[PDB]
Swiss-Prot record:
It comes from the Eukaryota. The lineage of its organism: Eukaryota, Metazoa, Chordata, Craniata, Vertebrata. Belongs to the AIDA family. The chain holds residues 1 to 115 of 305 of the full protein. Acts as a ventralizing factor during embryogenesis. Inhibits axin-mediated JNK activation by binding axin and disrupting axin homodimerization. This in turn antagonizes a Wnt/beta-catenin-independent dorsalization pathway activated by AXIN/JNK-signaling. Interacts with AXIN1. Disulfide bonds: none annotated. Residues 34-69 form a coiled coil. This is Axin interactor, dorsalization-associated protein.
Amino acid sequence: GSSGSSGMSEVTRSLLQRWGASLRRGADFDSWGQLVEAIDEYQILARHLQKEAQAQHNNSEFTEEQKKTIGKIATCLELRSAALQSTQSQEEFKLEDLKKLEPILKNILTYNKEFPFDVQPISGPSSG
């Protein structure tokens, strides 16, 4: 096999951490006034979300129901980061809507789908 045992090896737990640590921070910047740094954080974190969502060999240390969200959470990010970059606008993603992923990420394993937002899962085999 590859995964090993169903559930969570242990490294996956370290992720949700470093991950949740990103968003948490990515926000800290916003509040203060570090959009630049913020974006980076979000993006970087977003990119990672994909690296796990899209995966390299459709592996993904996480299940399908998990990666789904992961691949989604990113989407939101793409909005947040952009929201920052965006100048002539003011109807994109907000913080609350962003921090709304803070828990999700953590409650990824215990995520019965039904995202509070309209964000499609980046990459992944659909239909079938």
